Amino acid sequence: LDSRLPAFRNLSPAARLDHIGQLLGLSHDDVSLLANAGALPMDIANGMIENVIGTFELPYAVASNFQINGRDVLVPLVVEEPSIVAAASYMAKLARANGGFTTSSSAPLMHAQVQIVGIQDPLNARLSLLRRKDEIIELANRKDQLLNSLGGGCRDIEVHTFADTPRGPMLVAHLIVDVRDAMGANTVNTMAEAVAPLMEAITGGQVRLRILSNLADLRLARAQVRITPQQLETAEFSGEAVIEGILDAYAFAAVDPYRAATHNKGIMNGIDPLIVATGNDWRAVEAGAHAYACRSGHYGSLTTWEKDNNGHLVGTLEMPMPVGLVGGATKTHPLAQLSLRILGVKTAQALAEIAVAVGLAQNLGAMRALATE
Amino acid sequence: LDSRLPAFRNLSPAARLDHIGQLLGLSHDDVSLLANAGALPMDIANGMIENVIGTFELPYAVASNFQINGRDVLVPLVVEEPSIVAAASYMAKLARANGGFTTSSSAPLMHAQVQIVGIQDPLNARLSLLRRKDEIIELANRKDQLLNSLGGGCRDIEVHTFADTPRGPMLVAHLIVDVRDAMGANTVNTMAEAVAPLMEAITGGQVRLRILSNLADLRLARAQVRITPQQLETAEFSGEAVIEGILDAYAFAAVDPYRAATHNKGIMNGIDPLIVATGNDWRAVEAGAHAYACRSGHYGSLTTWEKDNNGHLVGTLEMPMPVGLVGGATKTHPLAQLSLRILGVKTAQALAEIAVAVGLAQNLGAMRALATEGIQ
Numbered sequence: 001l002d003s004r005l006p007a008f009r010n011l012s013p014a015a016r017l018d019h020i021g022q023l024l025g026l027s028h029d030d031v032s033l034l035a036n037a038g039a040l041p042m043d044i045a046n047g048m049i050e051n052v053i054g055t056f057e058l059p060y061a062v063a064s065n066f067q068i069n070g071r072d073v074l075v076p077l078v079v080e081e082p083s084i085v086a087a088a089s090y091m092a093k094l095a096r097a098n099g100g101f102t103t104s105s106s107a108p109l110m111h112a113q114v115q116i117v118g119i120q121d122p123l124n125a126r127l128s129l130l131r132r133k134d135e136i137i138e139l140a141n142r143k144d145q146l147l148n149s150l151g152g153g154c155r156d157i158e159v160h161t162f163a164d165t166p167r168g169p170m171l172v173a174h175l176i177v178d179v180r181d182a183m184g185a186n187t188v189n190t191m192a193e194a195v196a197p198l199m200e201a202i203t204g205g206q207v208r209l210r211i212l213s214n215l216a217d218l219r220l221a222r223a224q225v226r227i228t229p230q231q232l233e234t235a236e237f238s239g240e241a242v243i244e245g246i247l248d249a250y251a252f253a254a255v256d257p258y259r260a261a262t263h264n265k266g267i268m269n270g271i272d273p274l275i276v277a278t279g280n281d282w283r284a285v286e287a288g289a290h291a292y293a294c295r296s297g298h299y300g301s302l303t304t305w306e307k308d309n310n311g312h313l314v315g316t317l318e319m320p321m322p323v324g325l326v327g328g329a330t331k332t333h334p335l336a337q338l339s340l341r342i343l344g345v346k347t348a349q350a351l352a353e354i355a356v357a358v359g360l361a362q363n364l365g366a367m368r369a370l371a372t373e
Numbered sequence: 374l375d376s377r378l379p380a381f382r383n384l385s386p387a388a389r390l391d392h393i394g395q396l397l398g399l400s401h402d403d404v405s406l407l408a409n410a411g412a413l414p415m416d417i418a419n420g421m422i423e424n425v426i427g428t429f430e431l432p433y434a435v436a437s438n439f440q441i442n443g444r445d446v447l448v449p450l451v452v453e454e455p456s457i458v459a460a461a462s463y464m465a466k467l468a469r470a471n472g473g474f475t476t477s478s479s480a481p482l483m484h485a486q487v488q489i490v491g492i493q494d495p496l497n498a499r500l501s502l503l504r505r506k507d508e509i510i511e512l513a514n515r516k517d518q519l520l521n522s523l524g525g526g527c528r529d530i531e532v533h534t535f536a537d538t539p540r541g542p543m544l545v546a547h548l549i550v551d552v553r554d555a556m557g558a559n560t561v562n563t564m565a566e567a568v569a570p571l572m573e574a575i576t577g578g579q580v581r582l583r584i585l586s587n588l589a590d591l592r593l594a595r596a597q598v599r600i601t602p603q604q605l606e607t608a609e610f611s612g613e614a615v616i617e618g619i620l621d622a623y624a625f626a627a628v629d630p631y632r633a634a635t636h637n638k639g640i641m642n643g644i645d646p647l648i649v650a651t652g653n654d655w656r657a658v659e660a661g662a663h664a665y666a667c668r669s670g671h672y673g674s675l676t677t678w679e680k681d682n683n684g685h686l687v688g689t690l691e692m693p694m695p696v697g698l699v700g701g702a703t704k705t706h707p708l709a710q711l712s713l714r715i716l717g718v719k720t721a722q723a724l725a726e727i728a729v730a731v732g733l734a735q736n737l738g739a740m741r742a743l744a745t746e747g748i749q
């Protein structure tokens with residue numbers, strides 16, 4: 001694949017769609033899903049959520065120029081706001097000159113919380129759980145034999161205590177679960193429910209909440225980009241001066257939450273539309289993102305911007321990125337499936353890596369514009 | 374208006390649309406926007422964002438039972454995830470028995486930031502700006518005649534310093550701008566750019582960033598709800614015990630960020646789908662919400678839950694809520710306009726007040742389910 005899409009910006013929607021179909025070797029019938037309204041039929045929509053009266057469209061777009069670990073990728077995006085897609089495509093074009101985006105990710109590990117109340121010895125009860133951790137892990141894994149055969153499963157447990165709250169002592173167990181190609185919510189919740197009776201027997205306490213955490217800080221995806229000063233030169237400003245301006249803008253985000261909120265919103269402009277296009281839960285991605293940004297005790301920037309030993313601008317994005325290829329609405333929505341086909345992703349972590357590349361690109365675009373006006 | 378919508382959950386989509394069309398007196402043309410797929414014309418879609426190749430549908434639903442300061446309201450929602458609309462609807466049903474949701478909001482005030490670097494005396498420059506604030510405020514208000522004539526504009530300035538960063542001393546001025554019925558980005562960005570030269574002249578620094586803040590903590594919207602124990606009784610648990618379980622779930626969120634993230638995500642399950650239904654920017658609402666949740670230096674719960682002196686469960690939500698009745702897709706998408714019609718909102722702050730009511734109801738529904746689920 002060549003993702004450069006020359007003159008895409010100026011083609012009609014129909015022409016653009018035909019080119020995409022040609023590049024990818026889409027069938028006529030796949031192209032029909034975008035060439036005509038109504039790919040989400042009403043019997044599917046009506047079964048997805050409650051009280052349905054119709055469907056609501058947003059535009060479906062494709063960003064150009066992306067390249068991830070040396071492979072060109074086409075990126076579908078669904079959103080209402082202008083300039084997002086153009087900026088992403090432009091920053092991807094710049095990145096390609098220097099190797100594109102380089103990405104990595106952790107295993108798809110999600111937390112399942114099990115909250116325990118009713119005991120006067122939470123700190124002791126924590127150790128009772130840990131002593132019996134293999135038993136707990138085995139009980140969790142008995143509940144999803146398929147996931148274990150797919151290469152996932154409950155890997156570990158961690159236990160945290162809150163001995164002094166206004167509502168009395170609490171203990172919180174986390175199952176740590178590899179959820180393979182799912183976002184993970186229903187997969188881990190089921191394990192949390194399975195182990196609850198055993199945790200009650202061990203601790204002597206009462207289990208209350210059994211629920212994933214959206215702070216998915218064991219499910220991290222990472223992206224890098226590099227930009228040279230020559231690329232950032234304008235009529236008004238040297239590239240070197242733009243790079244210094246971007247570093248100043250970054251330091252401003254790092255110290256001031258009023259700026260960090262906006263800086264990180266720019267990142268989510270790039271990410272959330274890919275999450276929507278793939279039928280994934282964008283509230284989950286947002287909650288993970290912004291809670292992670294404040295993990296230090298200060299709400300700061302998700303990205304970093306620095307100058308390397310050659311004077312080049314180097315950016316990173318590392319963040320939680322819980323997404324699926326299966327589960328929820330990813331399989332339900334025919335255009336979610338088409339998006340995954342467009343992307344060519346074969347694992348959920350591959351999708352997560354593309355997401356962070358797009359977020360990094362969108363922040364780059366915002367940094368560049370704001371440093372050059 | 375009566376928003377109870379009896380039997381709604383079991384009616385066909387077409388019958389549901391008929392029933393709300395009767396209640397509202399929707400025109401033929403309004404109803405027909407949902408007779409067939411494709412209500413967003415491709416020429417409008419193509420003008421909205423770049424590189425458009427088609428459209429992407431999500432389900433469009435209406436939550437029932439909502440009442441805001443005594444008035445029934447119907448709430449359109451666009452989202453992919455189950456249980457949200459039902460939970461919001463059921464908690465709204467319970468709320469009605471005790472007066473519905475009570476709401477308030479601040480004026481639609483947004484921050485514009487102007488970042489100034491390279492000043493050798495930033496703390497002194499800040500006073501030079503504050504002395505000249507009327508001048509700055511008048512410059513800000515020079516160009517947007519329409520906003521001024523509608524009762525908005527720049528109201529004030531504040532100035533903050535960060536004298537020691539790794540990139541040297543920074544001054545940051547904020548324009549405080551009433552943006553009336555807009556979210557406000559273009560309004561405040563434009564003002565930030567306009568005032569920049571003058572600030573530079575006063576301070577002697579280089580202006581760098583000129584840009585809104587999404588941490589819209591002067592644009593707050595507030596909701597309250599009340600639920601009695603009799604309303605919460607289940608087969609297994611008294612309503613009193615359910616209240617205690619909900620308070621336990623709240624305290625857990627207040628102390629543990631791993632729970633708070635999830636808890637707040639449930640609020641946003643309620644809010645974001647209304648933002649989407651009205652053509653508004655949900656990334657801006659998300660950023661304001663979650664940044665606000667950590668203003669203290671601890672990432673906590675946006676909602677509060679207590680028991681009052683009568684033993685009733687009382688909940689609050691106060692948060693930033695920047696939304697528009699105008700701008701972008703809110704104007705150009707025919708269903709964003711239909712949603713506004715369904716809602717009956719006449720100002721952006723009224724839309725914000727409904728948003729927080731729905732977020733509050735969603736969080737209550739989520740907690741209630743988790744607090745009452747038996748052990749397996």
Ligand SMILES: CC(C)(COP(=O)(O)OP(=O)(O)OC[C@H]1O[C@@H](n2cnc3c(N)ncnc32)[C@H](O)[C@@H]1OP(=O)(O)O)[C@@H](O)C(=O)NCCC(=O)NCCSC(=S)C[C@@](C)(O)CC(=O)O
Nearest residue numbers: 009083084086087089090262263266269365366369423424
């Ligand atoms: C890219 C923009 C929108 C237009 O740039 P321009 O200099 O006109 O680009 P140019 O015309 O040179 O085209 C260069 C490349 O840019 C792409 N491109 C430009 N315009 C379009 C378009 N209309 N459609 C598609 N592609 C476009 C395209 O890839 C093209 O390559 P090609 O010539 O090979 O096709 C430029 O205004 C810009 O970079 N904006 C970045 C900031 C921006 O508004 N971002 C949008 C979201 S807003 C955001 S993230 C919120 C913030 C800013 O508050 C976040 C924060 O505060 O941090």
